[PDB]
Amino acid sequence: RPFRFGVNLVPTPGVSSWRETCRTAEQSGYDVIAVPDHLGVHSPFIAMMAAAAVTERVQLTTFVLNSAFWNPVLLARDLLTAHELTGGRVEAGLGTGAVRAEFETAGLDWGTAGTRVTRLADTLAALRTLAVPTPLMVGGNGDRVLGLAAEHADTVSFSGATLTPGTLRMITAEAMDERVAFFAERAGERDSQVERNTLVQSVIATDDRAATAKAMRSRMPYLTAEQILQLPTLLIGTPAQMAETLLERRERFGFSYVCVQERYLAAFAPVIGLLG
Numbered sequence: 001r002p003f004r005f006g007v008n009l010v011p012t013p014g015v016s017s018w019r020e021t022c023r024t025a026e027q028s029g030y031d032v033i034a035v036p037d038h039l040g041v042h043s044p045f046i047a048m049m050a051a052a053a054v055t056e057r058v059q060l061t062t063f064v065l066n067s068a069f070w071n072p073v074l075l076a077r078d079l080l081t082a083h084e085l086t087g088g089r090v091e092a093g094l095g096t097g098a099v100r101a102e103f104e105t106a107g108l109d110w111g112t113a114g115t116r117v118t119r120l121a122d123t124l125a126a127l128r129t130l131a132v133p134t135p136l137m138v139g140g141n142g143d144r145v146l147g148l149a150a151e152h153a154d155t156v157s158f159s160g161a162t163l164t165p166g167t168l169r170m171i172t173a174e175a176m177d178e179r180v181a182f183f184a185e186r187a188g189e190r191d192s193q194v195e196r197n198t199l200v201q202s203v204i205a206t207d208d209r210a211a212t213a214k215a216m217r218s219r220m221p222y223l224t225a226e227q228i229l230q231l232p233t234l235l236i237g238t239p240a241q242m243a244e245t246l247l248e249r250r251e252r253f254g255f256s257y258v259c260v261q262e263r264y265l266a267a268f269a270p271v272i273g274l275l276g
């Protein structure tokens with residue numbers, strides 16, 4: 001599948017730069033602006049509308065909604081509105097919800113891993129029954145979550161890191177091979193209809209990728225330098241090397257929809273120049 005590139009921006013209360021940041025994202029060649037769903041961050045659909053008003057080409061996506069925060073019927077209303085009032089520029093990523101303290105602040109039951117996945121399941125089923133027109137993305141590496149992506153999603157988002165639900169450990173390329181294979185088995189005949197996404201956490205420009213990886217072992221002692229150079233959540237090297245790495249990872253994992261974090265927007269833009 002042809003590459004699509006996204007940048008995960010954080011619309012921040014009290015910071016007046018949102019419109020400017022969105023314009024920079026488009027001008028730098030990104031295809032998607034992604035926004036998160038967290039307390040203390042601007043509300044995602046409202047921020048996406050503000051982004052749509054200053055950009056003409058990018059898609060806008062949630063990355064990802066906390067399913068506990070949304071009534072499915074009211075979310076379907078929001079998704080139909082965002083679709084119609086942007087001319088079809090909105091996609092919605094959904095997840096189970098990550099931060100317990102946020103559930104508690106909003107007066108919501110954290111429950112169990114099982115109840116949080118069931119909530120996602122119930123929302124996806126409802127959104128499909130209501131025939132929402134926004135493309136749907138499902139993010140997470142859990143068996144049940146990837147099963148839900150295989151059943152319901154237009155895009156599956158694989159996480160390149162694990163964390164205790166309640167900082168982040170990066171997962172090896174070999175564990176990623178297994179997660180993509182798991183997804184593919186669950187998707188069956190629908191596998192080829194689902195776009196595969198991943199979020200790159202760090203984009204490290206360097207003329208010595210090998211020396212960089214060796215130094216980064218201190219942040220990741222459970223891995224060798226060779227493993228670090230294959231981690232899907234890291235891009236290390238020159239832009240040409242990063243482009244070749246992304247080509248190799250599209251072949252290995254199927255990752256064609258690659259997002260980076262806001263802090264790396266300019267660092268990664270040369271790679272868009274080479275790949276497009």
Ligand SMILES: C[C@H](OP(=O)(O)OC[C@@H](O)[C@@H](O)[C@@H](O)Cn1c2nc(=O)[nH]c(=O)c-2cc2ccc(O)cc21)C(=O)N[C@@H](CCC(=O)N[C@@H](CCC(=O)O)C(=O)O)C(=O)O
Pocket residue numbers: 035036037038063064065066067094095096097098099113139140141142143145157158159160161162163164165166199
């Ligand atoms: C928690 C996570 O599970 P997951 O299926 O990958 O993800 C579930 C949700 O977090 C996921 O659906 C999303 O809500 C998370 N999410 C966001 N969630 C949000 O709520 N808002 C966001 O803006 C958001 C952004 C986002 C972006 C990218 C991304 O990859 C995920 C994002 C995980 O790390 N699982 C690990 C660890 C599971 C584990 O072993 N847990 C232990 C350790 C915890 C303990 O000590 O008890 C246990 O439960 O006992 C694994 O599958 O191996």
